[PDB]
Design a protein around this ligand. Structure first.
Ligand SMILES: CO[C@@H]1O[C@@H](C)[C@@H](O)[C@@H](O)[C@@H]1O
Ligand SMILES: CO[C@@H]1O[C@@H](C)[C@@H](O)[C@@H](O)[C@@H]1O
Ligand SMILES: CO[C@@H]1O[C@@H](C)[C@@H](O)[C@@H](O)[C@@H]1O
Ligand SMILES: CO[C@@H]1O[C@@H](C)[C@@H](O)[C@@H](O)[C@@H]1O
Ligand SMILES: CO[C@@H]1O[C@@H](C)[C@@H](O)[C@@H](O)[C@@H]1O
Ligand SMILES: CO[C@@H]1O[C@@H](C)[C@@H](O)[C@@H](O)[C@@H]1O
Ligand SMILES: CO[C@@H]1O[C@@H](C)[C@@H](O)[C@@H](O)[C@@H]1O
Ligand SMILES: CO[C@@H]1O[C@@H](C)[C@@H](O)[C@@H](O)[C@@H]1O
Ligand SMILES: CO[C@@H]1O[C@@H](C)[C@@H](O)[C@@H](O)[C@@H]1O
Lengths: 294, 294
């Protein structure tokens, strides 16, 4: 066990391809460790580092199956960087952007083609989108959502193609959790608002289905009491308070992968620094008490 | 603006000569910054750095008036190090000791001569005493309190001249806050016990008076739900829950300087990452909403 090498609190990101999972956790030296679920849990060790950022790096991960994985982290040079998987080994990606030293990161693949959005916080504390549509044009600026709380968590999810549907959750300068939305016709301010939350309260999103009845979105958020709670959206909506409620360590990040393998990853104190998996199976249960390298 | 350079959460240390205060706060690049109170608050800026540790460095600070100041921090190499003041300018101390990567620091002067104790957590997770008695002998290993919780906070306070009195507060492997005492005739387990507290809950001790009726000890500590509360010992005895109960950011540190200039420093989310001063004046009040560099 080298669970004590895991940060307290760690940056956490999670992806899945069917019942194959990956969880990316921050080591306390800035190392971004991969944990693998392939019918059992492995990795999280020093030889599972896919890159090194600064101590306290946020992690954001996104994928198209396991055909393409992209993991985002912040270096000690206050630049967001990118680790890449294209089926035959990890490599450094072209994504390099200056961020506020306290910036969080969100990232999404758009549809089943290799199209990427990354959301970071500028020095001026605005949320800026980064766009990759193809190699010819490379990384460009997309939308800037304006002033956000300095240090805000940033949580992004996408579903659909033609058009793509994107939601980005972050805190405004009055500590409210708000939502930036895109459905093909410009960015708007969404229906989701959690009033007057804790400064830099952690945020995690997942989504499943398509626009209409099948659609689901879950947004996991820190309460001022070191709980992680859940806002939920299904089909045509009405945001509501979901059943997920769990005690966490102060500052726990949270990451979610979607139904039908709905899992939520946080730090609740197990083995001190270890990450815990919660699983929806007609009700919340302990999916795995502590992730590798425990 | 400048206050956004302070870590979230930040190591905090405080000392005082009469009504002259010094507060040491960690910048989010590991910078150890000095705020000064000389009838008004100043400092906290980049040209007030006295030393640079790893991001999330703990800070311990101890003084004999303002004739002698010692400030302890952890470097990027997992070595606890010292910045010194002898009344003529800041220099690098001889104290360089290996520490677990997540180690805290407690440090005390013993009496009015130049005698120092530093408490750290070793790689094996034991609490280690470092002894400085004179130049002839230099830094030596002292007592070892055994297994502690990996990443425990460490708070240390001393009073008295001969015998010297030392109390060291830290978290055992069962998450209980416990006390190591020295009254001149060997170390013992003290009466202070705070059962099954949050793994690595912050800790801050001040003491005043002398063994006898005039003795004060105040131990500030973090609760599971982001309050800082207080354990109080007055002269003769009986630990009691103190009046001091404030809301904090997740993982806020706490530092305190003794009555009759009793002030508690913590991070409650004012200007996001600013340190707030509480004052004792027949009841707890706000003394300084936000410390420099804000
Ligand atoms: C062998 O390939 C496995 O699956 C890939 C999707 C990556 O997660 C890689 O780190 C892992 O070793
Ligand atoms: C081919 O380019 C690689 O993958 C693209 C989808 C981007 O993530 C890019 O930064 C990376 O270098
Ligand atoms: C049409 O409403 C938009 O899409 C839904 C899926 C929700 O994200 C809602 O808050 C948003 O405003
Ligand atoms: C049926 O309940 C709703 O959807 C489930 C998938 C869970 O997210 C639950 O917390 C939520 O209230
Ligand atoms: C049946 O296994 C459940 O689903 C897997 C895909 C993992 O999330 C595992 O930890 C969980 O117990
Ligand atoms: C004389 O040596 C200086 O003062 C002593 C009290 C110690 O703090 C030592 O590390 C420092 O270099
Ligand atoms: C006499 O009791 C000893 O000294 C007191 C000042 C307290 O620190 C107590 O916990 C300790 O065990
Ligand atoms: C009687 O009041 C006690 O001593 C004061 C000096 C404060 O520490 C207060 O919180 C404590 O309850
Ligand atoms: C006289 O003013 C009070 O005491 C000073 C020594 C400082 O603690 C100051 O911030 C506080 O308001």
């Amino acid at each position: 066990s080298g669970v004590l090498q895991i940060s307290f609190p760690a940056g956490i990101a999670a992806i899945r391809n069917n019942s194959s999972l990956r969880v990316y956790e921050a080591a306390l030296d800035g190392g971004v460790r991969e944990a693998q679920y392939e019918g059992r849990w492995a990795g999280g060790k020093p030889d599972n580092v896919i890159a090194t950022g600064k101590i306290g790096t946020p992690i954001a991960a996104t994928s198209v199956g396991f055909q393409y994985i992209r993991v985002y982290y912040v270096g000690a040079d206050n630049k967001a960087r990118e680790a890449c998987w294209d089926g035959k080994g990890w490599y450094t990606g072209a994504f390099v952007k200056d961020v506020a030293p306290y910036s969080s990161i969100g990232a999404v693949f758009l549809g089943k083609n290799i199209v990427v959005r990354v959301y970071t916080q500028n020095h001026d504390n605005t949320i800026q989108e980064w766009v990759w549509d193809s190699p010819s044009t490379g990384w460009t600026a997309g939308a800037n959502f304006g002033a956000a709380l300095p240090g805000t968590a940033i949580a992004a999810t996408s579903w659909g193609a033609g058009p793509y549907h994107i939601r980005v959750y972050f805190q405004d300068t009055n500590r409210n959790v708000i939502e930036s939305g895109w459905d093909g016709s410009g960015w708007y301010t969404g229906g989701l608002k959690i009033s007057n939350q804790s400064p830099r309260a952690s945020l995690g999103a997942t989504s499943w289905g398509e626009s209409g009845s099948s659609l689901g979105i879950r947004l996991y958020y820190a309460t001022q009491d070191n709980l992680i709670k859940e806002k939920a959206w299904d089909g045509g909506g009405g945001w509501y308070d979901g059943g997920f409620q769990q005690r966490s360590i102060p500052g726990s990040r949270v990451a979610a992968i979607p139904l039908p393998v709905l899992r939520v990853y946080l730090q609740n104190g197990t083995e001190v620094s270890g990450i815990t998996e919660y699983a929806w199976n007609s009700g919340w249960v302990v999916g795995q008490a502590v992730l590798p390298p425990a």
